[PDB]
Amino acid sequence: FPVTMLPGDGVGPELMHAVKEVFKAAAVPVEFQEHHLSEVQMASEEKLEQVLSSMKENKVAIIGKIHLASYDMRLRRKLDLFANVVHVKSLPGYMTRHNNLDLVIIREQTEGEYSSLEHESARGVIECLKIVTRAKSQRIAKFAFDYATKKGRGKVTAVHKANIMKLGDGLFLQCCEEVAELYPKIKFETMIIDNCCMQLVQNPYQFDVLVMPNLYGNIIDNLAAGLVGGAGVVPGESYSAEYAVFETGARHPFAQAVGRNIANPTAMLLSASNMLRHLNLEYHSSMIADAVKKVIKVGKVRTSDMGGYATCHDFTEEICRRVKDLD
Amino acid sequence: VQTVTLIPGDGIGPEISAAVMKIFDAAKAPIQWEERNVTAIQGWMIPSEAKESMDKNKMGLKGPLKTPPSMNLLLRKTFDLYANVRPCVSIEGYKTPYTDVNIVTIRENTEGEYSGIEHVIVDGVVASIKLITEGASKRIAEFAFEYARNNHRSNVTAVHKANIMRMSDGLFLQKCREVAESCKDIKFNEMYLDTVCLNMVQDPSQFDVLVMPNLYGDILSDLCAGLIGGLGVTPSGNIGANGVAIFESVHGTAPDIAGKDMANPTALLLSAVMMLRHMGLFDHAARIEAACFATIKDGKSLTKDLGGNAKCSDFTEEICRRVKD
Ligand SMILES: Nc1ncnc2c1ncn2[C@@H]1O[C@H](COP(=O)(O)OP(=O)(O)O)[C@@H](O)[C@H]1O
Ligand SMILES: [Mg+2]
């Protein structure tokens, strides 16, 4: 099973190191092929093609954060990764102010304010264009409802600011309201991003699946991730019609911690476990995920973000010995 | 003795306005009220007696309004309300999962994605226009640094997404950076919006004053209100031109309980406290604010929404006898 790997920015390379080590100890029949897109210089469109080419062959990737539009938006258009899914789920032993929480955040990832459409309209007055199209709003709405259909979920909530951006956000809501009628066995609710963010802090349990355009997904991804423990533990994945690339849920380089063996690889490991599920290696997927989850519940070895003193390497090997203790 | 423009509003508005009136009188506050109605007429604008009142008194207290052109966008243009101040403070003795929260959000109120400017480019393709200007940015940043200097705050954080929106948010950042160089007594730092949201929910005590453009401010102020109990206990003031400022509740009209003596008037009251401090009446503000917090710490008479079942009258009455010290 070949898998495209992009180590990415900041502590990205360190996290792939932990995935690579845990995979070896679990005898994961997976062979990573490494490519580099983050922080390149004219070598831009070349490196993007090597990814698309290996993606046509492997159809599945695992990537760190990736530091004309940005390299991230370009990759996501080049691969058509319109849909991004973040599983916001409590880890049983890792206690926060909101335990037993299980949300899905679905964000559109190819338009909105991430388009880099800005220009100086006069000395000191900058204009910036947020883009909403019918085609992409429809597609992310069908994805969310097919997701909640497949995974046995009850409610899908569309988050927006159509009371202010009546045309653009309005058209996002409209496509959501249209699609919702095709899925009558799924509850459909709408909510203004303002309130939704307050709601998620007071009582996030009222939600199930959320779907939203780009910028609101970047906010809610991070807010909700912080509910269940923060960027060290929360995973993510991005889909095309034929591709699936797995990543962290609240994407951050963590420049501070590079070289200090400090970063928590839980998010990247859990993500790698979902990647294995996507590859029909269910036995390996549930083993790695169960080992990650048990080392945290037990409480002996834990990184700084989770109240402990352990290094990233200490925590990683505790996982490896536990997985080897299963084969 | 001074006059304040009072806009009771809709639903619980009258009840909570009257509750604030009774508390002010009990506290012997030197405040008289000019009641006014701002439901819009067209020639769209607010009624002449509303504007004339506000232009003369400068201070206005405004309850929840019904949503139909929004009367709050109208008020904002009519008085150039450019600075939205929203202090977010843990209520001693109203338990949430968060404690010792003390954050002030300074939100640019004129610009950003709130321009009102959108186009249908071709069928099925909309562009919405975010607008960031040099003057609005410098103005809001000068406001956040004056607020920090006048209220013992030590740190101003500028919240932005200049990595995604390089030119507009970048300009906002640059004007914050300039003003910060001009105010060496306030420690200044920069932080991405998503990163703030990621940390605010984990450790809210790392934040002091935060200044940001319109859309970010509208969202993060309400997130932060979740940390301390919701919109029913959160005050809000808007500062504008010609010394005009309007202090307001930001909760809904709550029609499900209008007129049933059940409403929570803490928000409008805490806003009326901001107002009192804005007018120089520091002693009445502190007594009224002290009387309010003490009623809540005591617990024996909270309104339904904060886990009790006292009427709005009983809650209002305990504050009145307390503020007579
Ligand atoms: N792999 C990780 N392990 C533990 N904590 C992390 C990890 N990644 C991110 N974080 C937390 O999330 C924050 C990410 O924000 P940061 O990397 O400083 O970038 P930004 O400049 O986007 O704010 C870090 O400060 C850290 O506390
Ligand atoms: Mg708001």
Author numbering:
A (entry chain B): 15 to 55, 57 to 82, 91 to 350
B (entry chain A): 4 to 46, 51 to 75, 81 to 337
Show the paper's wording:
Human NAD-dependent isocitrate dehydrogenase or IDH3 (HsIDH3) catalyzes the decarboxylation of isocitrate into α-ketoglutarate in the tricarboxylic acid cycle. It consists of three types of subunits (α, β, and γ) and exists and functions as the (αβαγ)2 heterooctamer. HsIDH3 is regulated allosterically and/or competitively by numerous metabolites including CIT, ADP, ATP, and NADH. In this work, we report the crystal structures of the αβ and αγ heterodimers and the (αβαγ)2 heterooctamer containing an α-Q139A mutation in the clasp domain, which renders all the heterodimers and the heterooctamer constitutively active in the absence of activators.
The binding of ADP/NAD at the pseudo-allosteric site causes substantial conformational changes of the sidechains of His275B and Phe277B, which induce the β12B-α8B loop to adopt a conformation similar to that of the β12G-α8G loop in the WT αγ heterodimer. In the αMMgβADP and αMICT+Ca+NADβNAD structures, ADP or NAD form hydrogen bonds with His275B, Phe277B, Ala278B, and Asn287B (corresponding to Asn273G, Gly275G, Lys276G, and Asn287G) in the β12B-α8B loop and Thr207A from the α small domain. Besides, the sidechain of Phe277B makes a π-π interaction with the adenine moiety of the ligand, which further stabilizes the ligand binding. The ADP binding at the pseudo-allosteric site may in turn stabilize the active conformation of the αβ-αβ interface and the active site, which may explain our biochemical data showing that the addition of activators has a weak activation effect (1.7-fold) for the αMβ heterodimer but not for the WT αβ heterodimer.
